[PDB]
């Protein structure tokens, strides 16, 4: 920031493709999969909690 304010460096170009990244099928499906796996683990947490609160085992398949 000081180099830019002192004029010793050029401001960065927002449009330079060296400053950009292409979010392809893999990294996009990964974003989906993170959200969806988190939701799945949440649902598993509620389901298992409502069973262990009764002090008995539970079937992870269900």
How many residues bind another protein (CB under 8 A)? The answer is 22
| Local structure of residue 33 (DSSP, 8 states) | H
Which residues does 19 contact at the CB level (< 8 Å), separation at least 6?
12, 13
Contact range with another protein by CB under 8 A, out of 1-9, 31-39, 40-48, 49-57: 1-9
Residue in 33, 32, 36 with CA at minimum distance from that of residue 44? 36
Which residues between 27 and 56 bind another protein (CB under 8 A)?
A: 27
6 is an interface residue for another protein by CB under 8 A: yes
At 10, list the tokens: 């050029």
Site of interaction with another protein (CB under 8 A): 1-3, 5-10, 13, 15-24, 26-27
């Amino acid at each position: 920031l000081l180099l830019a304010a002192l004029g010793r460096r050029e401001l960065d170009d927002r449009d330079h493709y060296g400053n950009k990244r292409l979010d392809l099928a893999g990294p996009l499906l990964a974003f989906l999969f993170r959200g969806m796996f988190k939701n799945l683990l949440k649902e598993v947490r509620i389901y298992a909690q409502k069973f262990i609160d009764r002090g008995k085992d539970f079937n992870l398949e269900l």
